[PDB]
Amino acid sequence: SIVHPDNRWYKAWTMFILIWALYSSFFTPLEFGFFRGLPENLFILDIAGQIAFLVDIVLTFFVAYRDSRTYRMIYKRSSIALRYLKSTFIIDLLACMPWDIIYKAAGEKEEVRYLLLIRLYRVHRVILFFHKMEKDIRINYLFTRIVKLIFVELYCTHTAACIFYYLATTLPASQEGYTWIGSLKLGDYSYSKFREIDPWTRYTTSMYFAVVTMATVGYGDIHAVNMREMIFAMVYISFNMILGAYLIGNMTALIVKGSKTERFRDKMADIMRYMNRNKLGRNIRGQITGHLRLQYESSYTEAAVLQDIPVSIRAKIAQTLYLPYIEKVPLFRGCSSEFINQIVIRLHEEFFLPGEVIMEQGSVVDQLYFVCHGVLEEIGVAVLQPDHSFGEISILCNIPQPYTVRVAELCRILRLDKQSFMNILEIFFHDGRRILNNLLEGKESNVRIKQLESDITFHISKQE
Amino acid sequence: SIVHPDNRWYKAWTMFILIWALYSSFFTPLEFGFFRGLPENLFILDIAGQIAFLVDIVLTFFVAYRDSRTYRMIYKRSSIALRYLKSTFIIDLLACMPWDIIYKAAGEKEEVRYLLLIRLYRVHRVILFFHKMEKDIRINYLFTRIVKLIFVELYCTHTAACIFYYLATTLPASQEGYTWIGSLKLGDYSYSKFREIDPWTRYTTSMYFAVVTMATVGYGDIHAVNMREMIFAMVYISFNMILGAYLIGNMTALIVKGSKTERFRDKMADIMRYMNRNKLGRNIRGQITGHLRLQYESSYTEAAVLQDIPVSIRAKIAQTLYLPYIEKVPLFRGCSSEFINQIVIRLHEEFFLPGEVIMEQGSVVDQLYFVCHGVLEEIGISEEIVAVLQPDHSFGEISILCNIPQPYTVRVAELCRILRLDKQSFMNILEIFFHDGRRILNNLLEGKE
Amino acid sequence: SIVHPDNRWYKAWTMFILIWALYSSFFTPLEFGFFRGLPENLFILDIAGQIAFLVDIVLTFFVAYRDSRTYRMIYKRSSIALRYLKSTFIIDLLACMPWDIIYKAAGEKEEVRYLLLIRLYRVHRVILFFHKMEKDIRINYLFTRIVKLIFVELYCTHTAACIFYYLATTLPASQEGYTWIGSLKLGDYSYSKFREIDPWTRYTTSMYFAVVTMATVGYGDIHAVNMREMIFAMVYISFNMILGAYLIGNMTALIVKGSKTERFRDKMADIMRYMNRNKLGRNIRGQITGHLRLQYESSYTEAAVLQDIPVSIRAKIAQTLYLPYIEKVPLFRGCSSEFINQIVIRLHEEFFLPGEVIMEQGSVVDQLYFVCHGVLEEIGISEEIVAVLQPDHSFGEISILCNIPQPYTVRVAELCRILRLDKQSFMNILEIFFHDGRRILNNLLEGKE
Amino acid sequence: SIVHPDNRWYKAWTMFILIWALYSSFFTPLEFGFFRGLPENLFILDIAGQIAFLVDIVLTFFVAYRDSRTYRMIYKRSSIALRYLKSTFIIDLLACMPWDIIYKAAGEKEEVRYLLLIRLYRVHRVILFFHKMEKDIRINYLFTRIVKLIFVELYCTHTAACIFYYLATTLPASQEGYTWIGSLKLGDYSYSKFREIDPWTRYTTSMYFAVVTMATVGYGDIHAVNMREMIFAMVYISFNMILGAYLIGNMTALIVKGSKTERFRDKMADIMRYMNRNKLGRNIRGQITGHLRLQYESSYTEAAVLQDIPVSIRAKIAQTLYLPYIEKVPLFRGCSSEFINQIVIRLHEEFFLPGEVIMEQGSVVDQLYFVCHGVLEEIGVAVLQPDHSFGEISILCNIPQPYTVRVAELCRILRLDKQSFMNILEIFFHDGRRILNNLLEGKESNVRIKQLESDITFHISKQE
Known about the structure:
4 copies of one chain form a homotetramer. Chain A is mostly helical. Chain A is built from 20 helices and 7 strands. Among the domains of chain A are: 1-124, no CATH class; 260-294; 310-463, Jelly Rolls, CATH 2.60.120.10. The first copy, chain A, has helices spanning 8-25, 28-32, 42-58, 77-87, 89-94, 99-105, 110-114, 123-135, 141-169, 199-214, 227-257, 260-278, 282-307, 311-321, 323-327, 337-345, 393-396, 418-427, 429-439, 452-463, and strands at residues 348-349, 367-371, 375-378, 382-384, 388-390, 405-409, 413-417. In chain A, the strands form 2 sheets. A 4-stranded antiparallel beta sheet of chain A has the order 1-7-2-5. Chain A has a 3-stranded antiparallel beta sheet with strand order 4-3-6, with no helix packed on it. Chains A, D: One of its GO terms (biological process) is potassium ion transport.
């Protein structure tokens, strides 16, 4: 009866065990502290949680585990237990035994309740969820990080408050003077008989010490008074420093890493340092600024995405997006299926902004271009509406293109090198003659369209 | 009456809200704390402050808003409010209700004043301005950020001290002992009856707690002495723990990206490693470091960062810069604009320190130069200064055009900003414009008779 | 007898110095502090410790040293010592002199013991090991650094507490009041006669001061009460101020460069921005995110970082990886090694999730694939599984060679690591080896009868 | 009598004024604190410093200033004063008047001595030197940064100690109880009559407060007791936070920026993550590792340096380094002056490590290569000692080179694209025929040397 880890019912169960793991993270320290055994009522609540994890450790041999390296989903029930018995099985079993009851049976000895600290490991269940919720891309990174540190602190000071109160209670009532709380004289309130004041006061005071110690404030109203309380202040203060450096380090890691907007900062302020050097006249300055800025972000992110991912998906997504207009674009009309599908998968997007000047006179256009969307204005001569193409003039005639390319609005341009263009023809020479024969048809307007026919036969010599 | 956000009157109006939000973001904590109701005097200020934001929410339906995703300005008088009614609406409206008045009439209940804590949001107006001041770079970035960090703190330690002094006043007069301020014994000054001490030194003492706790100093004169001051102190300390990391995260974000001595040190790090590897001459080191000093002293450390702008607009920049210098040169006297324009596109920018030898007598020269600013001396080897190159002069023309080695060792006497043109750049333009090339030869003959 | 540093005996010998430097870097502060001379028992340990380093400086002339600049190992028995005599020499030699013995004989002068503070250098041995442990990465970097930042700060407070307790003992017994430890009133425990209290709780109390000052907590139970403890406390606090920044500078250096969830979030940041911009289909999002989940769950996020290694050695890597899989494929039965070797060079690595459709029936295929690990099912459309592709199988051969569309829709039932070969890559090798191409056609005919 | 700023005598004078500025930085606060006027002896020391700066402000109108933007060294005496009278003249003059003497003349009023705080600006003189010493590349960056923060903190706490003691003394002796030092009870030492204890104790105590406050330790033994001492603790604690963030920020800025060695970290540990993914067999692994690593650092730093700097210097340094062997290298022998000087200035260095495999069979060598140093072993065939060249076979014959290039040791290779090679010939066609005529001579060994002659005439058709 193996069950998939992604099964909704088992996913709900893990969330159910999370709440029963969030309870025992913030209630096990209370059992190590103020409570020397569950009086009457917490028994049913503790045993319910224990059998909840006892059935959970039972319901782990049928849970389909999957190795990260192999990335193989394993249905083998017997092979599931190989990882569990070595990873967390030993720790988990010691966290399910009703150690409080066996504490009550072994003469109420205090040695056994020290081993109850293994139940503190259950907090790792909710930390794993924070890792998973970090893995989930839905929510903001700042929100989960701040919440994670708010939690990895709330828990640390809470477990350092229920233990510090224990270190005061490990001495008898007679020697309560040599404790951090028995000698407390906060204002006119004297914590004389701490063992019998209201439980809420002796905990909030304990949490006060942990929080004013974690943040390295240290008022000194509450402080270690004994060697055992000093030794714990040794570990806790040193540990908080490492966590404090980690929290500080993580916070500035997020700020430094969050440089997409700091890339904006870079561009703008480097132009700004150049201009603190020169106070350049701002008209052309800001115009070219806008242009470069937007074109850059566009092309850069385009490369980034089109670069990763297996080729088949890039082939398919390009077909979904580039193929429609390429099928019946003026420069590429009457082609075949494999011919259009070959070019698209290796088309490079080079978007150009409204008003951007792409090329000018005397430029050898070695990269074929196609207008996916928007109107183009070749004010060198030609107006290219959406679903148009250009740039062939310098590919086959080899004379540099005398067409100053100017964008009217939102000219989406696909770049295809002239080396890539001639590579397409040779692979499918049959369709290469068809597109050239279609190219020899009515589109004979001017030097880039009429003289096109004379240099179209140049590839005819190549393919014949 | 839709009003554009760029309107000078409306923009100055938001400053009027800003100056009154600054007053109301540092008076709301005081009203929640030291004051159990404003008695007589600043009541006029309270009413005017409550209507200042009330007349703002009224006119928020007159403003024109822009959608960032579409980047299109919207003047619609019906689609404006959908963003407003689902972003703040209630928090702005409830911040205008005179909570002082309703408290003073509804049995002076203490719980009513707690709703006045939502007026602390009005600091969001002055943090939006800092965001706007961040967007328009203008001022130095190390200045605005430090001012921003010295504000989220100055506002916190001002609202965490007025709130903390409120906690002490929650207890009755007879229970002054169980308070953070009633049990102070600072030196010979005892805060026995704190409520009868002047509010001035009460706020300073209360703020003394806030800043020695904020900066994690924590002297220990003032600490929580209750269960309410205890719980709040943990909350305020925890809040500063994540806010304090933010402040030093931003400060180190500026130093990391700061264009300062950090980056030039790397420039000499690899080059000095190479000349020892390349075992070049000692005189070579003096020149390159001199140029590097010529390039690091003035921090002339941008050229490929400026070339980030495409050539399809860097020409526009070159024609804005280098075209006016080229036109008045006697060599190009009468040259066509397109011929001159193409020359400017291919020009380059370099500096030369005075005392250096740009070219040697009898040497082959493959570069063209034009004087923009500064004086050069054409010295012919004794060494005699054959000619003086004032700004707007051309030198090196003989070697490129006439394939004749330079007979004058021109030396820099004062630093000059000199443009540069290459040989094959010059030939290509010459072939296109044969008429311009012939006129240049005539100009050179007439200019050096 | 020159000994190579890589010798197992000598390397284990330096650990013997390391374990005895660890003992002597946490006992020198104790000897400078609590002990005014080691009375009887650990005298044997003191003498052995002083000769342990003395036999080390003796044998430092037997070791073989390497010069990093030349990267050439030197066995010379005369040029070895020039580095030694000008780097440490004196500090190592003076660390071996039995300062305990000379103190006990020269009128038990207090000033003599101050020269024993130079034995604190012996912690440099155990910080060099951490540097060496840093060089050989091996263990997780977040582990070694934290252990390092738990050593410069477990040596500094241990030596700033034993030194601080020494300052209290400088004053006479009658002047216990003007001390940091003589005037303690921790609870009902009064440190009246601190010298008569057990050294155990004296060190713990003294270390209690060191760590609440190190971590900038500063409770205020223990503070400087003198002019000597006052001056030292400012020195120790200032030293931690620049050392504390170093510790959090290193910790944030690891998180910045940590290859963790920080970087994948950017990968979905731009792509998710594009499909909405490209208005692609919803089914497209499920696939790409699935592959991205296939690539982020396993953190298979390196391919261009692996392509950083030149192709002139990435082939060597490919032949180490992909050559053994290619050889036993029935299609290449009897193919020459060079023909097989060239195929491996052009191979590529991809993953496919089970349940996906790699190719569709009747579709044009331009890619070649070979099974390395995992099982694939050749399903022909009802849907019938025509064939089962065990590891070491070839599929898609028909479409590329015979220009015939695939008649089977092969679907992934279990995740497979499949190599990839392109068409024009296949044609180019085929033309070079015509004999191999003919045999492949014979193998394909014989393999699919 | 204008003097150059780089003149050694004036450079010594600035260092002399630095010491007299380092004295008045650490002694002006003492004049604001314990000293209510110079008793007898410090008069001659103070006035000597004042006339030292009085002659210094005099000797600034003849000091040749140079604007950063223009980078022009100005010899004009009258134009020197334009910057000084606007930059620091007003501040400086108020720092030269003997304010202590005028304090003694105006009824010993304490208002005038407040304005003595302007003398604290003299610390900017030594901060400028730290900027200059940072500008100097001789010394380590970590050393100067740590020293700079050590100073800018020694000074900050020193000036916050001499002011805090002032805030205690601004109250009369009768009300000394309401001060931070009059109420001090450190241990059994009572600071009862602070105004008459030894000056060294009341200063070290004052410096104790500043340092335990700056580092955010805050023991609380010494603390503010009055409103004026609280208000200064407001400014000082807040100011130290900004400086503390700056010191922390600078320290981690140095660590993050110091990534040349962290680039090593990157390469090695990315290979390490790939291998934690696969435990790849290490033989070939580490061999290819070494190769890639060293070749990468070499080529990368080479590009970096050869990339900046005006062209003339790169032309000259390449002549000093590349020209010697290029003059008489086997593939380039019997050439002319301009021909060899043209190629060198646009030669790109591509160093290859001992044992590195550069190219293989079937590779179209479109980049000419020359062995500057080291022995090459073309185990495809040819052994190339230092001062040798190869790679021409695929440039003119166009057949891909069947020469597997293998390095014996330290093969320094200069890269020259075949497009650059043919560009060289056309510019100096006269010398292009001479090198080809020399190429047609005895070097006719094999297909890349003997068949060379047949394809040498291909350029003869181009140039004729």
